[PDB]
């Protein structure tokens, strides 16, 4: 999906609670589940990518961190 499309999806789920410009891990699990179900198959690398991308260690990722995450978990 295009970054424009990706931004709309990101915003939709981040809006659920907390900072509207951040996605927590549970918000990201719901988003993947309904938006990219195929990315939640087989052994997951979600926690490893999440741990590495949440640089500030606040349990949340920004839009650019989410983009990299979708990119990487895909290959």
Q: How far is the CB of 38 from Mg ion (least distance, A)?
A: 26
The conformation of residue 5, written as its DSSP 8-state character, comes to H
60 labelled ligand-binding: yes
Closer CB to Mg ion, 52 or 58, in the complex: 58
Q: How far is the CB of 41 from Mg ion (least distance, A)?
A: 26
Closer CB to Mg ion, 27 or 60, in the complex: 60
Per the CB < 8 A criterion, the answer to whether 49 and 40 are in contact is no
Interacting residues of 12 by C-beta distance below 8 A, sequence separation 6+: 31
Q: By CB neighbour count within 10 A (0-12 exposed, 13-18 middle, 19+ buried), where does 60 fall?
A: buried
Interface residues toward Mg ion, by CB under 5 A: 54, 56, 58, 60
Query: Which residues define the annotated binding site for Ca(2+)?
Result: 22, 27, 54, 56, 58, 60, 65
């Amino acid at each position: 999906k295009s970054p424009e499309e990706l931004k709309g999806i990101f915003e939709k789920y981040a809006a659920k609670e907390g900072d509207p410009n951040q996605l927590s891990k549970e918000e990201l699990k719901l988003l993947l589940q309904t938006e990219f179900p195929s990315l939640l198959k087989g052994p997951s690398t979600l926690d490893e990518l999440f741990e590495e991308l949440d640089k500030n260690g606040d349990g949340e990722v920004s839009f650019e961190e989410f983009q990299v995450l979708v990119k990487k978990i895909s290959q």
